[PDB]
Amino acid sequence: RFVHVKNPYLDLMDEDILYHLDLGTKTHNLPAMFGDVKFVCVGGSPNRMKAFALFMHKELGFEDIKDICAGTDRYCMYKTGPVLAISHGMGIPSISIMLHELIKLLHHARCCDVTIIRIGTSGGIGIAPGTVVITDIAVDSFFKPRFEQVILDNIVTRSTELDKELSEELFNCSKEIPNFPTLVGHTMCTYDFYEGQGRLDGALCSFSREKKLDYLKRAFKAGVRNIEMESTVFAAMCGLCGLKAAVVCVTLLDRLDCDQINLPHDVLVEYQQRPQLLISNFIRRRLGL
Amino acid sequence: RFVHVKNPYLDLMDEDILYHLDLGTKTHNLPAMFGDVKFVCVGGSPNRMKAFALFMHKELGFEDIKDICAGTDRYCMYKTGPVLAISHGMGIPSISIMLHELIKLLHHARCCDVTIIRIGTSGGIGIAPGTVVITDIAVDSFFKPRFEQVILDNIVTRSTELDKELSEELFNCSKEIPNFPTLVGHTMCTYDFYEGQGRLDGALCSFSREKKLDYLKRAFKAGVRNIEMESTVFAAMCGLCGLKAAVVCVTLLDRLDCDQINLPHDVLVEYQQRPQLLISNFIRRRLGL
Ligand SMILES: O=c1cc[nH]c(=O)[nH]1
Ligand SMILES: O=c1cc[nH]c(=O)[nH]1
Ligand SMILES: [Mg+2]
Ligand SMILES: [Mg+2]
DSSP: OBOOOBOTTGGGOSOOEETTTTEETTTSOHHHHHTTOOEEEEESOHHHHHHHHHHHHHHTTOOOOOOTTTTOSSOOEEEETTEEEEEOOSSHHHHHHHHHHHHHHHHHTTOBSOEEEEEEEEEESSSOTTOEEEEEEEEOTTSOSEEEEEETTEEEEEEOBOOHHHHHHHHHHHTTSTTOOEEEEEEEEOSOSSGGGTOSSSSBOOSOHHHHHHHHHHHHHTTEEEEESSHHHHHHHHHHTTOEEEEEEEEEEETTTOSSOOOOHHHHHHHHTHHHHHHHHHHHHHTTO | OBOOOBOTTGGGOSOOEETTTTEETTTSOHHHHHTTOOEEEEESOHHHHHHHHHHHHHHTTOOOOOOTTTTOSSOOEEEETTEEEEEOOSSHHHHHHHHHHHHHHHHHTTOBSOEEEEEEEEEESSSOTTOEEEEEEEEOTTSOSEEEEEETTEEEEEEOBOOHHHHHHHHHHHTTSTTOOEEEEEEEEOSOSSGGGTOSSSSBOOSOHHHHHHHHHHHHHTTEEEEESSHHHHHHHHHHTTOEEEEEEEEEEETTTOSSOOOOHHHHHHHHTHHHHHHHHHHHHHTTO
């Protein structure tokens, strides 16, 4: 299963400059650097993805680690064996830029049988803080499994279907881990952290506590268990380009109780490190380690 | 002219935790730290905003500089006199999170007569690469001066009107600078860098070169001179909250010729530093320096 691009113009170009990743087909040997990539792990925070790469290095059995995108502060990239770790910033536009350049990179490198997993934090709906949610379906603010984007003057809608067997395999992996609360459920992706997630603590708020609670309860009823900001564009682009995608997010709070993240530093760090424990278990099982 | 929030729930909270800025009303004395802020300058790149703060420090007459948000890799913040320099990442969601927390911060600090200027890069339409565009009107992909966002289950539309006299004053400032190509024109804000700006070099492309050229020419006809990814949410939030906003972007290429940014390193650095020259001139004139 090869990673493929869906653009007939790429083939016509003499060189491909991955401007935001500060990489290129002329300046770099992409099949030699990335041809053996089988696992791509993406998160927002560059410090957290650096820590994930260092963690995976030890989990793969090996005994500081160079940013392949050291030339740019937009994104960071680390590679340990068949595992690629990439930061993507916050929001649908920031991850979309990364995904466009990454899908082109994996296709130039002729990668195949690639699993890509978004790891991060989210807000929970009716679930205990620190719960790990494996997304089965990524939905928009209207609880619809679709990704809408504007291309020129037109709105184009794409499917956000995530690989079902991969979400089942990640859940089966999670059961072996002690003190690891895990759940398979829908994930709602929004464009705004504050008004877009029904928060009452933003600079702007025109709705009531009752209106936000009714909204969150309807989301729970539609099967939504967590809220984040990258899942729909991630699921839509990866599925379409030959990548088996998954979303594994830890919850930092239950939105049916509050909007402000107020956790002790050591609890926040523990929760933040829960998705990487599952991915490590999953990669180690896939590689026979 | 005080910076104001538009949320009756903020007043009811005992403390306000600015989670992404790693600041708070309980942990910090916000009126003492930021009460004298009169100029806020925002850009995507943390390295570029660090360099801007160091540059402004010397331009204000003073003879390394501490990140006020050093505790988080999401955003960076530097202060030199009445000038606040903040990174905001890429895209409408990343800058929206920053703007929500920043408007709350400036309001807790009781700031007044605050000018906020987005400085950055963009793609040009029918203008020479390296041209500085001062936005008069920020428009969406449909060339409409509006900012649409999803709040709970509803779409809410806001005005993207930028301060006219401030754009005229920045243009008058730009005329004194030698070898500084400058223009006042509309700026189109998109959610996607590739398909969203009519690029033919993304991972996905379902349209033709002719369709993208027709689109860009219609944008030029509607008064659009540059394309970037943060202007509409920036103009919509700031205007509504008592901030006099402006957008000053340098163009890296003319989109009527190409999609890939291919510039010599020293030309890219020169172009990147053109918006900060104008802001320095503007702040120095405002302060009588
Ligand atoms: O509530 C939350 C917490 C983390 N990320 C989100 O998008 N929402
Ligand atoms: O073409 C460009 C260049 C910089 N930023 C953009 O949004 N578009
Ligand atoms: Mg880097
Ligand atoms: Mg910081």
